[PDB]
Amino acid sequence: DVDLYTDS
Amino acid sequence: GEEERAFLVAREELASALRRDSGQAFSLEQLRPLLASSLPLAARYLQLDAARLVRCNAHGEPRNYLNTLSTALNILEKYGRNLLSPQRPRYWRGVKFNNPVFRSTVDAVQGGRDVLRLYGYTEEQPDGLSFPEGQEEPDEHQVATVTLEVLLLRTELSLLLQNTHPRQQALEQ
């Protein structure tokens, strides 16, 4: 899945 | 009067379904009652500020900004369905402004971050939005209501991009 949260 | 009643019954019917199965796809038949309602646009969206989201992002050509808006809405819909999924993703409690996808899709539109606050990302920091540490879990009823209107509005913009909206000359306003 695609990361929509972390700043990194 | 009776038009508002038919509208709010279909509204809760899809929102409840989306609360049972967060990954539940909806067809245009199921959504036609909300799209085709005679009610004005301002009255068919109760959480999402649809009037502003459309007008305040009409820059350049429609083929450009209507795709830019549809994309932000598609991602926002995922933000909503994620909070409803039986296994919420890790880090679901906060969204940081420098996240690549959010920056280049959601943050790129005026009102995108306002939709996150509707989901429950109310606490603002200089690096992003996040849920209140006190709140244990999402308000399943509020998330589902917001996701449906995001899903719905994106659908209206899709019909216009296909040029087959029930009242296309209307939203031309």
Author numbering:
A (entry chain C): 334 to 341
B (entry chain A): 4 to 176
From the article:
The linear ubiquitin chain assembly complex (LUBAC) regulates immune signaling, and its function is regulated by the deubiquitinases OTULIN and CYLD, which associate with the catalytic subunit HOIP. We here show that CYLD interacts with HOIP via spermatogenesis-associated protein 2 (SPATA2). SPATA2 interacts with CYLD through its non-canonical PUB domain, which binds the catalytic CYLD USP domain in a CYLD B-box-dependent manner. SPATA2 also harbors a conserved PUB-interacting motif that selectively docks into the HOIP PUB domain.
Indeed, species conservation analysis of the HOIP-interacting region in SPATA2 (aa 212–356) revealed a highly conserved putative PIM, Asp-Leu-Tyr-Thr, between amino acid residues 336 and 339, which is similar to the OTULIN PIM (Asp-Met-Tyr-Arg) (Elliott et al., 2014, Schaeffer et al., 2014). A complex crystal structure of the HOIP PUB domain with a peptide spanning the putative SPATA2 PIM sequence (aa 334–344) at 2.7 Å confirmed binding of the SPATA2 PIM to the HOIP PIM pocket. Two complexes in the asymmetric unit of the HOIP PUB-SPATA2 PIM crystals are highly similar (RMSD 0.7 Å), and while they crystallized in a distinct space group as compared to the HOIP PUB-OTULIN PIM crystals (P43 as compared to P61), the PIM peptides overlay perfectly and occupy the PIM pocket in a virtually identical manner. The major difference is the presence of Leu337 in SPATA2 instead of Met55 in OTULIN, and, indeed, the SPATA2 PIM resembles the “original” PIM sequence derived from p97 (Asp-Leu-Tyr-Gly-COO−) (Elliott et al., 2014, Schaeffer et al., 2014, Zhao et al., 2007). In contrast to p97, both SPATA2 and OTULIN constitute internal PIMs, in which residues extending C terminally make additional contacts. In the SPATA2 PIM, Asp340 forms a backbone hydrogen bond with Asn101 in HOIP, mimicking contacts of the OTULIN PIM (Elliott et al., 2014, Schaeffer et al., 2014). The structurally highly similar binding mode was also confirmed by biophysical binding measurements using fluorescently labeled PIM peptides and analyzing their binding to purified PUB domains by fluorescence polarization (FP). The SPATA2 or OTULIN PIM peptides displayed binding affinities of ∼300 nM with the HOIP PUB domain, but did not interact with PUB domains of PNGase or UBXN6 in this assay. In line with the in vitro analysis, substitution of the conserved Tyr338 in the SPATA2 PIM to Ala (Y338A) or Phe (Y338F) largely abrogated the interaction of SPATA2 with HOIP in cells, without affecting SPATA2 binding to CYLD. Moreover, co-expression of V5-tagged HOIP and SPATA2 variants showed that the SPATA2 PIM is needed to co-immunoprecipitate CYLD and HOIP, demonstrating that the CYLD-SPATA2 complex is linked to LUBAC via the SPATA2 PIM-HOIP PUB interaction.
